[PDB]
Structure formats: C-alpha cells, structure tokens
Amino acid sequence: ADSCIQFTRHASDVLLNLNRLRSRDILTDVVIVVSREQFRAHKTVLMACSGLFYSIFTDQLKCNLSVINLDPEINPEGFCILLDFMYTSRLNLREGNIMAVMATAMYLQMEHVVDTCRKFIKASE
Amino acid sequence: ADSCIQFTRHASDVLLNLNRLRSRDILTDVVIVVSREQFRAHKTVLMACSGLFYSIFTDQLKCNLSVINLDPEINPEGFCILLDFMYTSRLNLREGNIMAVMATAMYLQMEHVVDTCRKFIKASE
C-alpha cells in the first residue's frame, strides 16, 4: 500500500546486525578463499552487494557450494576491505590500497566502489 | 580505520536486494507457519529484525530447523505486514490492522514497531 510509514534507521540497523552475526560466525554459509586467506560470510549479503556473487549463487550448481575460490590475482587485503564495506557501508580507502581495492571491486562487480576509486585516483593525477 | 568513506545508500540498496531475493525465493532457508499460512524467508534477516527470531536461530537445536511454527494466537496478516517491514523498512499500518500488528510486534520483539503502534493508538484516544 501507498499509506506506509518508514523507519529511517531500519536498513542501517539490519546491516549492523548482519555484521554482528558475521563477527560471531552465526549462520555463515560460505567460505571465500583468496589465495592463502579464508573469509566466512553469508551468501545473501555477498549477492546483495556484488554482481559476481549474485551470478555465482544464482547458478544451479554453484549455489550449493560451501567454498568459493577467487582468481589468484585477487589481493586478500583488497577483498577484506570490500567485504567489510559490504557489511558496513564504510570503505577503508587509502593511498596504499586503492589500486588493489579498485581491481578487486572491478572483479566483484561493485560499480559504486569502482567509481569512487576512479575519482580518488583522478584527483591525484 | 577511522579514515573510511561511507556510501549513504548502501544499506537501503542491500535491503532492496534481500527483498528481491525473497520475492524470487532465492536462498530462503526457513518457512514460518502462522496458522494456515506459510511465509518463506532468510533466517539472517529475521534475526536482524526480531528479538524472538534472534533467540530462536541462535539456539543450538532450533538454528537447524527449516520450519518454525508461531503461536496460534498470531494473526497471519499482522505477521505478513511485519515481514514486509523487515525487508523494506515500510510498515503498512492501518486502523483495521494496528491491533494485530502491535500484538505481533510485541511477540516478535520489534520495539520500534511497538512504539509507533502505541503512539498511533494513543492519538486516537
């Protein structure tokens, strides 16, 4: 109905709780392997944030996998920064990590992150 | 780090995608039964929104259940309205449903919804 009222903070409060479940390893259902590093997560949050994970977990065979191995060229710190962004809306973008973050966001298909990386790089040229 | 940048719309965009997955029945992992009605959902979203579901799905036996039956006194339309609110931040509160919505939100332990129901009822006294 068009007569709904809306609770402004609801979406951010849901995301905070999903991150608390991730921190406590509650109902995590996939491990993402990035070279020597493993990251536990919820498939639904990954799909909701990434075009690559949306494609992976909607595939009729890959939806059932409990381990996903990323391309060996992917930087684990870049992936960690993006996984934290998925669960918090906050991106720890620094001069020392921006190239790895942008490459990882292009691979994961995270357009808004790629856009802000491109802008920060362009400002330093 | 405290040097993070933040994408304002991220949390609302994640919630929109979680609702799209719910609509398409993608990676839903529980059925909530409310008398004669069944509602498919994601356990993590339910836990993130409700004190009752947070308690249920953190229990070492109930976390593994694929069907949860609610108390027979719970109104299915009231539950449906609250499940839609969990996934959208929008509450379809009407004169004809407010009593059932408030009773259901008290049972589910959804404090902000109970508070707005109490205010709307108090305004009509």
Binding site: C4, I5, Q6, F7, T8, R9 | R90, L91, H112, T116
Partner: peptide, 5 residues
C-alpha cells in the same frame, strides 16, 4: 524515527 516516505 518514523517518516512519510
């Protein structure tokens, strides 16, 4: 919080 969206 609550608002008219």
């Amino acid at each position: 919080a609550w608002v008219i969206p």
